[PDB]
């Protein structure tokens, strides 16, 4: 169940007799009230119709009108929210409607609210799929990160949200709500870890977080490998990234065995660069505070595990979090260094700011021992991905078409979308080095793709895919600056489908 | 009277019996309802008190709660707006309160609203001064620029705003409202001219706008000088700016004689660079669309005249709008050119992007013929002013301390503030040229000041001041991108005081 201060219930009772602090109804733009709103209007003797006739609420998506006590209702307030003029909403409009409702309710002193929104239609979504989107939007919309504020906002009075559904849909709605709550809990852990400042959130801290998660979930086993063990394993490019920082690196291994021992596991590999200065290839100063989000890949592995552990899915899951801090220093890796990866391939490190792939490639080699049926790495890897796909769609590459399709489908269902980019063999020659087996960077052309090509050289032994979340893992500026928790919804949906 | 679709009335009637679509009341945070709100609450039998006790409205500045029909009231709706917990508001909080009220009313279908806000106290402001700020904020908040949108917003239903005031204050409130309406009308003309795209708003267009203003106001006389006349006058630096563009330059002269012929006039000189590419000293591409705001100086002279003409102030006023377009071309002015200004001083044009001062200096020489008692130039002159003072405070320089103080005081009253920067003689040597009498730019140090020093060399014959509005004339980005209309409120207030 959701942990962020909200209980979500599903009930099949009549809205017009439900006791609640706020009853929420949808109002169309220039079309008749839906069945639920009409039943409530009838119960009040036409009071809602009479208000709407006065014209303050045009009915555009997300517009609101709040009424107090109406005759013959047990609702203390009635919140009208506009649903536009279309027969069906798209996902974006449904989310906008839900967020407008939540924003209003947050500011009220009501301890609960009941959503009578079952008459809304959303393109391509039945009861379960609508509940997944609605509850995830509501629950994630409650997220707060204020532990470093001396002045904290007043706690919400709102503590309970009831979804009204016809009895024939209530089981699907309940299922969707339960899954959405687990996803939102995972997103909240991901966002917390992403938002923590890098002087607190370093690799050792992430190791202790993993141990704490195992304390909470007896089904989770955790092992944390330090720099001595990494050197024993021959993890040369991983160590090269870490060596310039005072902070020691960590390889965190999470294991959950929800299925029979004969089922091959799915492996999630997360880039956990807790801060990325670029190293000797130093980044510019402007906006470099957002490099604390360079561990959002690893954070999303935490969050996906958190959701899976709550749902107790019948799957075998492994998490590999490759965490290091990338700092300049008198002992840092230099451009031109050549290192031997755990696979034995030598890499010429042309640019020390292309370091995510250097911790990932050793983790991908490590993943071979699990004989996985799928391996997915998640990383804030290339600014080129933002040029290619922006901030709303993650880049996706892989060496197996069926797995890539499974991830695309999961992202569509989750409304946490990705988009495939090709790993054509012609791109690989961009990584040729006169000195070593591989150069760690290509040119300025196709940067997201050549990063995927680099990783692919370590993933040939299994079905593998790669999510570039450089654009989707956080919001850069404004009031809403901070980690997003993506791609936890995509990944959790992928695993939900693999668990059937 | 305000021309943008709003009637402003002042009335001294009881709020609790006033017929209106929406009655607006202030609610303090954690302090008793004020006298007006308490009288309305009493009339409803405690209905407003009873709602507030439920806690939906914390009372923070600008928070709102909208009620429908309440017992025994003639108001169709009651809008409660939070006024915070302080005894007195500052100007910023008063504006925020007013804007929140207006934003709510805009979205309602009510044709009018009545503001019962007389109990609000604002630091240092009596009835007249509060009405000046309130009505100007409301009227300017109604501004719309949509002539290039194919899809225009629905017209507002709100067409009338009534300010309720005690009979002892109603004359002061009425005076403040009348002046604020004239200022807002002037701001709207300024903002229109600033927001027009530069392929429409060129110097010839501004000349026709001046002629149109004289058609509307019989007290205004207008003369428009073309490039032939400028060359006859010897206006060499003005012509040098204009010569690279296909668009001919214009010197627009506005004259209003509201006082006896023995009163020396006040002169406003406006920089009207209708687009500034930098010329041969070409600007970078990023954000260069905002260079259509490089005529906001001249636009503010239009707007100040528009307000003065409506108020029929007993003063003699002259406007000089120096308008040109600054373009690269095969005949454009080159860095290193030396030109002879109308004053006879030679200027070495080191950078063709410091062109505002080159049209202004010839206009300042031209102003000598009016034997003025004050000359104020207004210009979007230096990006250095934004570094120095940001986007909320205009830079102010001058050669006469009394005039500078008068302008500072006017800006404080108007809440359209400026701040003096010094024209110490030591800064002048930055404009030394080995070849000419003056260089048109100093170094990278004290750029706002050295621009003022350059202009001061043309203003020695009269009391003069210079407003750098590079930061305050427009908003750069976001939903509210566009011209602001500043410093029309400061300038109009200055002239209101000079008219007493
Ligand atoms: Cl169903
Ligand atoms: Cl640890
Ligand atoms: Cl250690
Ligand atoms: Cl985007
Ligand atoms: Cl799916
Ligand atoms: Cl008074
Ligand atoms: Cl003209
Ligand atoms: Cl001409
Ligand atoms: Cl600022
Ligand atoms: Cl004043
Ligand atoms: Na719609
Ligand atoms: Na949509
Ligand atoms: Na990097
Ligand atoms: Na990185
Ligand atoms: Na390239
Ligand atoms: Na206050
Ligand atoms: Na204030
Ligand atoms: Na310029
Ligand atoms: Na300019
Ligand atoms: Na300098």
Curated annotation (Swiss-Prot), chains A, B:
It comes from the Bacteria. Mn(2+) 2 binds at residues 271, 276, 294, 355. One of its GO terms (biological process) is proteolysis. Keywords: Aminopeptidase, Cytoplasm, Hydrolase, Manganese, Metal-binding, Protease. InterPro entries: Leucine_aapep/pepB, Macro_dom-like, Peptidase_M17_C, Peptidase_M17_leu_NH2_pept, Peptidase_M17_N. CDD domains: Peptidase_M17 (cd00433). Mn(2+) 1 binds at residues 276, 353, 355. It is an enzyme of class 3 (hydrolase). Coiled coil: none annotated. GO terms for cellular component: cytoplasm. The active site is at 283, 357. Binds 2 manganese ions per subunit. It holds the Pfam family Peptidase_M17. Belongs to the peptidase M17 family. HAMAP family: Cytosol_peptidase_M17. This is Probable cytosol aminopeptidase. It comes from Pseudomonas aeruginosa (strain UCBPP-PA14).
């Amino acid at each position: 169940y959701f942990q962020g201060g909200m209980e979500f219930l599903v009930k099949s009772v009549r809205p017009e007799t439900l006791k609640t602090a706020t009853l929420v109804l949808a109002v169309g733009e220039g079309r008749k009230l839906g069945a639920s709103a009409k039943a409530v209007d009838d119960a009040t003797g036409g009071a809602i119709s009479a208000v709407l006739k006065r014209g303050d609420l045009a009915g555009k998506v997300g517009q609101t009108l709040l009424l107090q006590s109406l005759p013959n209702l047990k609702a203390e307030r009635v919140l009208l929210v506009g649903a536009g003029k279309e027969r069906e909403l798209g996902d974006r409009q449904y989310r906008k409607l839900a967020s407008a409702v939540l924003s209003t309710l947050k500011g009220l002193a009501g301890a609960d609210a009941a959503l009578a929104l079952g008459d809304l239609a959303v393109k391509g979504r039945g009861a379960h799929a609508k509940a997944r989107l609605l509850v995830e939007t509501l629950a994630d919309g409650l997220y707060v990160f204020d532990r470093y504020k001396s002045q904290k906002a007043e706690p919400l009075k709102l503590k309970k949200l009831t979804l009204l559904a016809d009895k024939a849909d209530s089981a699907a709605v309940e299922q969707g709500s339960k899954e959405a709550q687990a996803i939102a809990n995972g997103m909240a852990l991901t966002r917390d870890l992403g938002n923590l400042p890098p002087n607190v959130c370093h690799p050792t801290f992430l190791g202790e977080q993993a141990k704490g998660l195992a304390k909470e979930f007896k089904s989770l086993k955790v092992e944390v490998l330090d720099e001595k063990k990494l050197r024993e394993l021959g993890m040369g490019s991983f160590l090269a990234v870490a060596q310039g920082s005072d902070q020691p690196p960590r390889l965190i291994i999470l294991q959950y065995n929800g299925a029979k021992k004969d089922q091959a596991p799915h492996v999630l590999v997360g880039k956990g660069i807790t801060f990325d200065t670029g190293g000797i290839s130093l980044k510019p100063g402007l906006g470099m505070d957002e490099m604390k989000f360079d561990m959002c890949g690893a954070a999303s592995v935490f969050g996906t595990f958190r959701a899976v552990l709550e749902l107790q899915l019948p799957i075998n899951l492994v998490g590999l979090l490759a965490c290091a801090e990338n700092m300049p220093s008198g002992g840092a890796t230099r451009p031109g260094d050549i290192v031997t990866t755990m696979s034995g391939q030598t890499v010429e490190i042309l640019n020390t700011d292309a370091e995510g792939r250097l911790v990932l490639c050793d983790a991908l080699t490590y993943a071979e021992r699990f004989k996985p049926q799928s391996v997915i790495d998640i990383a804030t890897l290339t600014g080129a991905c933002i040029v290619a796909l922006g901030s709303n769609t993650s880049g996706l590459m892989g060496n197996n078409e069926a797995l890539v399709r499974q991830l695309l489908k999961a992202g569509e269902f989750a409304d946490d979308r990705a988009w495939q980019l090709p790993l054509f063999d012609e791109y690989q020659e961009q990584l040729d080095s006169p000195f070593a087996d591989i150069a760690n960077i290509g040119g300025p052309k196709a940067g997201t793709i050549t990063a995927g090509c680099f990783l692919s050289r370590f993933a040939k032994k299994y079905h593998w895919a790669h999510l570039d979340i450089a654009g989707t893992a956080w919001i850069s500026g404004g009031k809403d600056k901070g980690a997003t928790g993506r791609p936890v919804p995509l990944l959790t949906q992928y695993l939900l489908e693999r668990a059937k």
